[PDB]
Amino acid sequence: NSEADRQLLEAAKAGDVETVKKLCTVQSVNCRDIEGRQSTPLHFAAGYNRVSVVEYLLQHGADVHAKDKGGLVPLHNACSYGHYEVAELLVKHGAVVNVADLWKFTPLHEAAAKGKYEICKLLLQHGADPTKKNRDGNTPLDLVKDGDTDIQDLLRGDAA
């Protein structure tokens, strides 16, 4: 990476909007972190709940569909750690809720496995499919832990 790209990525990880504003260009907004997993600034801002930076990035050309080395999109990252506002923002900017990574995990597999009730609810409201099997043959419902009966209820979708 160029020193400037490195600086932008750290600024995104940190939620440093003022620095992001300084460095963010057409050329850099979707740069990849070569030293990590080819994460974009938006991947980092999403995983670390940097809401103001996610807003800025999304308004300035950031790619919600960018895949990292594992095939993860920034929505996977937000969903894994329960970042509701970030997830909501990504979906508003056209994130596809059923997109799958290299292990065929969707963001709903992730939210389910991580026990994130509101994230699961948000994804389902936007048409996420709780029946999609990953590489292991597991659906998101399969990945819900025994005691998370609320998330089970949600993904099972009993008639209502």
Binding site: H43, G70, L72, N77, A78, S80
Partner: peptide, 13 residues
């Protein structure tokens, strides 16, 4: 090849 945890953390709003 195992799937690694996604990049991120449980950073409070």
């Amino acid at each position: 090849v195992a799937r690694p945890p996604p990049i991120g953390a449980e950073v409070p709003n």
